[model samples]
Target chain A: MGRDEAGITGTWYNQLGSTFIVTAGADGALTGTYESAVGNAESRYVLTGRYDSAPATDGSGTALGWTVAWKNNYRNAHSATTWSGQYVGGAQARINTQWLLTEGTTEANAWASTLVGHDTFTKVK
Target chain B: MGRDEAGITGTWYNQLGSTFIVTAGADGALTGTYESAVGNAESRYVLTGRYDSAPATDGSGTALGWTVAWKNNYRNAHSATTWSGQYVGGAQARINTQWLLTEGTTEANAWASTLVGHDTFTKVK
Candidate 1:
């Protein structure tokens, strides 16, 4: 949580895990695709979002506001994430929020305890 | 074009020539696919874009702004369009604006004189 949603474009990587590639598609738009930065399952674990630009502010405020529906369910589970971070320059944080339960029993049980913590994306161009 | 972009969701058809099925994937977001309204290549003439929310107004001024990257090359040409209209209950209007030239020779010539004409979508939710 450290940037305006629009400034969070290009590819970002984390030493902890996961590589995110985002694009500021429109004036206040956010569009991109990302996957696991490291670890095991590389094929099925993925995410894609069509985002809205945040409520405009001059950059020095609270974490500000931004959120999204985290899709690509580990093959099955609904997820949600809030985007918070100072707009130091480009904002890139992590996934740690609410996840909904669907019909998949195994998937539901798996996400119930998932914390989805620790992510810091540094823009590469 | 008297309609809110967000309220502009669902399947809509125009006897004038095309059928449009737009989905507001997220709040203040636009994601969908549409093709020729009538008279010609039903399969190839199309469009797709990643959109952002507009600068909200009290609903009584100039068409609230909305824009996008108009896709589908007419089998081979580049195009651009401004998403202008009114959010009259459910925003719907025609896209008629900037269009660029790509590598395709015939495609560019076809769209040069094209106005993209009239379009009015009514929600069929």
Candidate 2:
């Protein structure tokens, strides 16, 4: 049920109102910049991450993939994130992403994540 | 089979002579301090990562697990590393570690690692 995301490019948002600005690369890699909506200045985070999606061989050619590993300095604290999700639309498209906060930056929390976030993005003009 | 790894602690070396200092936590999580012997100060890398192992109710109580995520500014080239290994003995142990450089960092190399290293560590005095 994946769509060929070779063109899944745009801005999206989740229920919490966080902003996700996405762009596709010439190399089939996915990239996005996010601004947190409800946390502290650090928690109301600013993030850049990557993922990979393939053009489906069948069906709608949607893209389905997972975020690799990426770094983010939220609230002046270093943290890491990875994701697993799907994208299924061009207009008002809905992109579902499952995010891992693996802990609030620093070695003290580096090995584990205490928070997982469910983010949804809708293609908007 | 997996051991109940409540206490898999010690130092080990790989064929590359990489050093691995390990310790267990009260919560059953494991931590390690690493120094790369084969790579330079940047590659000779100083590292810290995490993994989980359990105790064995049957025979020798060995620790078995994999590293989570950790940080290292190897040679000033910001990078991240994760490991997977096993420890079998107290006096003399062998550990197999797989490391991911994930690239020289700097956003351009953030999501992926061009370098994946296979390292082994053995218990040392």
Candidate 3:
């Protein structure tokens, strides 16, 4: 699936009720907004990242990554989350990802403090 | 491969002779420095990203992502690049990635002006 037709460009939702609205460029650059229904559920975060269009060696899906900078500081410290995943498209398109959320007052602490988890987002549109 | 033993934490090299020295936390958080031998070869850029530990259904490898903010402006333009890839480990571990470099004096143009390419990094130690 190319970036324009039946690609990663669309609305997506996870089981946790977070929504991701993604738009892509021909160069694989991605821009998007993420609205979380959990954690800091009030704010809409922005996304910056890119994707890989090449077919996987195992014939699965393409790889992608997006980083979200949390507008509101968590625990009085700046925080951000980076998600890396594979977009599998078929009858039901889905993105399976692993995410790491980090927070700290400084760069050193930011890399040391983190929370990791997995999320699978199903296409909504 | 786990983070401590045989893992993405080490020195790596690409065909272009650029070097990447990576360090991974137990939680999959990654920190590193990229020394480019080409294109502003003097600077050592920092890396921030994460990885997925779950085994892929295809049994190939795991997904990872890293972002590099260029310290030296190109054409007097600020730029950054994000790379998303898969790390396949064995006797000879390798990371195959696709990268998008965006540059501009402002945010909007940064998303619009871009270059995309691929790099495969082989473990050196």
Candidate 4:
């Protein structure tokens, strides 16, 4: 079943009515947690993303490319972050990117910011 | 093989040197096309996304969530839009978000803007 859960099991959207639970383990790590019954109550986070190889076919006769990195830790409320990117795909794809927030502790502190996302991921079973 | 091509087939990152080919059909539609040898020359676009049911597990004892919508259409340069959101995941996830761009014709226009992305999608094969 696509290598038995390495990454990508969907459902993530934002603004109140929240609900999320993402999993990707077995070395290629990634973990996510979220909750919202209409008013921001329970929140958790931890992310470590990878996959800079294997899938290839970017000469664009259609679309295929890969390279990703992510690190996020937002427990309790907010603060604890990391981001990385390198994505390319055709059809209707434009992730013309930038993500910087090297690290953070808390207190709404800020430093690296640059991310432009126009993504489309469709896979359901 | 996971329903034999419905959606979600790896690789997407932004910042030039482009390479993309996204596909999703058989009713639940989404299509992407791209090309880049480093400095903008051949560009293409077409997007339509869906999947608002079937997978659910938001009580957050681990992680599992779904709900995505997308619409993009940039053939030669740009112009074509649509976005929607509602994401939640636990463990190490935060896609508490927004996406606005109701409609568009062209001319590097502006209006309806709100998109926050803190996403992690890890699936390799």
Candidate 5:
């Protein structure tokens, strides 16, 4: 149940050992840092996205989309990835996310170039 | 230049006569009502999305995405639309938005069924 809650500002961790620190700001904006256990593991990439608690019928609590751009260490370009998440709070707060990574220039091509995955993050700090 | 600002919680209006009331909440969640001057002119549809003031390099201030589901009165289904915006503030605040409207089941097909447009909304209240 995605209700109106405000405790999402904190540090979180995933089973794969990725670190995410979410900070809420004015106008429902969200800012954070993400240090992934996988690809581009060197830098804690800066992330930006927004959250919405609309009691949406999707049963996805507090929908939010956080996006990060990875530094293609092997190349001179960047790959943009956005994690669409559902923040669920409890004794062990959780954020279930589906991510899409793309490096295309057009929307249609981006759809074809998209790589998708899912992960569950728990509040660790 | 997009900087962190906190005064987006209020009423706004577009040149086309739409009315929008934005309300910010916990975890960077945004809830709002949009009474459009164009489609579904009878109902003030509910909206939900999030904002991110991450100093994005795109020259877009305080990025946010607000979505509305229209009541397709002529049909028995729903049409979804999302407005991606940049907040610019000053004596006369404004929100520049590019909207995408879609009604398809698959992402690939949705790309073909998408309708896009742009609008500028000014703070009215």
Candidate 6:
């Protein structure tokens, strides 16, 4: 269901032959609809977070901060499975950290992976 | 002067035969560079504001919040002149209110005008 808040929601293409649709809710919630070019399967997930009060300082002494939490999952194949994490970085830099913890039965066997990637956001008016 | 933060900054074309460049700072500060087709004169201005904690309820019963408090000023022609006010509404709606108060000598005689307009923002790396 669509909410009343305004935010970015769009599909992004990657060089690795993957396509993903990201929906950033008005409340700063994030959801992703993913499709792999390799297998052509689709999945959906949601992310929840809170803004960090104390930002960390970068190498240049610039204070950088980020929202603090998220939960990701596949919609169909692993409906009960989920992965949670904390994102760390500045606004301009790619969200370069992930502590992917699994949930439910399906994801319980999943391995941990750090996200060193960027996703372009397009607003869905 | 440029800052370390990232946001939207670019030129825009309007149907009124006007061209304006917008600089939305990392801290959510807004600045505008205007070129009017009528006179071909150029002018610049800055807008400062703070986000409101409690948002107002919209007609659809959705809570619509905004960044509160703003100080707008022209850069060159009237360096010290400024206008200040609070913004009301949701992120989707146009920022349709303005309490244009003047400052310094050049703007002291200016009349109050409401800003009922919209501007598209393009992100700058």
Clashes, model 3: 0
lDDT of 3 by residue, B31-60 (tens): 777777777345676566656533334344
Compose the digit string of candidate 1's lDDT tens values, residues B2-82. 124545565655455555556654433445555554332334322333222332244321121122222233331222222
Model 4, chain B only, scores a TM-score of: 0.22
Give the CAPRI rating of model 2: incorrect
How close is every model to the real structure, measured as TM-score?
A: 0.33, 0.40, 0.49, 0.20, 0.46, 0.23
Please identify model 6 stretches exceeding 4 Å from their true place: A1-16, A37-40, A43-75, A79-93, A97-125, B1-125
Best by TM-score: 3
Give Cα distance to truth, residue B56, candidate 5, Å: 19
- Model 1 chain B: ten consecutive residues of lowest lDDT: B96-105
Indicate the fraction of true inter-chain contacts that candidate 1 also forms: 0.00
Least accurate 10 contiguous residues by lDDT in model 4 chain A = A60-69
Interface RMSD of 3: 14.2
Candidate 5 backbone collisions, by pair: A29-B51
- List the TM values for chain B, per candidate: 0.48, 0.60, 0.82, 0.22, 0.76, 0.32
Residue-level lDDT of model 5, residues A52-117, one tens digit each, is: 533244333454556554532322123445565556656776776665554322323322434556
Number of the top lDDT candidate = 3
Q: Which stretches of candidate 1 lie over 4 Å from their true place?
A: A1-125, B1-6, B44-46, B50-57, B61-83, B90-116
Best by DockQ: 5
lDDT per residue for candidate 4 within B1-125, as digits (tens), equals 22223324334332333343445333222345534443223454333232122222323211111111121222221111222222223343222222221211121322222223333332221
Q: What is the DockQ for all candidates, taken in turn? A: 0.02, 0.04, 0.04, 0.04, 0.06, 0.01
Rank candidates by lDDT, best first. Answer: 3, 5, 2, 1, 4, 6
**Each candidate: how many clashes?**
20, 24, 0, 52, 1, 0
Error of 1 at A57 (Å): 47
| Regions more than 4 Å wrong, model 4 | A1-17, A23-125, B1-22, B27-33, B37-125
Question: C-alpha displacement of A77 in model 2, angstroms?
Answer: 3.3
- Supply candidate 3's per-residue lDDT for B123: 78
Residue ranges of candidate 2 with Cα displaced over 4 Å: A1-6, A42-53, A60-74, A104-112, B1-125
